[PDB]
Design a protein around this ligand. Sequence first.
Ligand SMILES: N=C(N)NCCCCN
Length: 355
Amino acid sequence: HMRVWVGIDTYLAVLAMERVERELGKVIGFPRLIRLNPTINGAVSFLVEVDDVGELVDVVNEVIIEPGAVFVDEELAVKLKPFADKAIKDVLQIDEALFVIGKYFIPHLRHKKGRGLIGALAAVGAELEDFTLELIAYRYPERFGTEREYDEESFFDMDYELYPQTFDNVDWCNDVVVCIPNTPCPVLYGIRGESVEALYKAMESVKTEPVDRRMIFVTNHATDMHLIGEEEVHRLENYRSYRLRGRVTLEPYDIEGGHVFFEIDTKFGSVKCAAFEPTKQFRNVIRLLRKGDVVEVYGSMKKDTINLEKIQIVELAEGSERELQPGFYEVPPSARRHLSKPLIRMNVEGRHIFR
Ligand SMILES: N=C(N)NCCCCN
């Protein structure tokens, strides 16, 4: 009656859970989908209770044989907490992962360099203060790689009935069904929501080709777990994401490609921000900024540039009737990054929500 956490680095995890739940023991609660630093990113972890940890390792390996895997006890699980934090909000080297695995004799399956190990350990050690659920439907093997068939309208009807119990599944303004991937992966669709109830209802209203397997995951998606407040650092750096307050010093200007840039003066000096082309209408908002506007930006730092996920216009330049209204703005659903918390999940005022 041993309780162990499996860390893998989602389809394969589901196949693995299956064999566990049928040949070695049960699975406690909901499996977990953890995303790592978005600038460097998924990894799955699940709690199980078997008798022979060695047996459990034997299974998973066969499954992986038809990649990093870790098997830690609920005990060590709490220790990996910091490793998980650094893997999500900072940068880790595969050395640091090999160290932990070595220090606590964590049984594992290593392949080559073993960069799958960082995710495997991170998935197990991640402590979720906030979280969201995701229902992932899979296709039958026979259809992997072919074109997904589904009724676009059914997803829009579904969001119309469930939103916000389910969210960021479709994009009305840009007319896109964002919960459906366009890759050779086994995933048919991935609906995000606030509960099993809503997700189950969603799965029942949506129309698509026959769904083979399905799994509701607990994830750090849409939580803002990657953001570092500016009161926590002395200097900013690339490959990290922040929530910075600043004052516009250089007004918006477009560049080749449909992107809009500008700069803000901050406790750290001037910082350049951007609203790349995929953000669509969100650029309309950005183009209205003016020298003097005080704001608070949220985003990943890359090449010394904040890649806007959302922004808050705190104060409009003192000396102006402008179109810009104070309050929150965010990229449309189709430009949403996995870890970005959507305004519909934030109990704040002045939220301008684009559905
Ligand atoms: N609804 C989802 N499962 N994902 C939404 C992703 C939006 C950015 N591509």
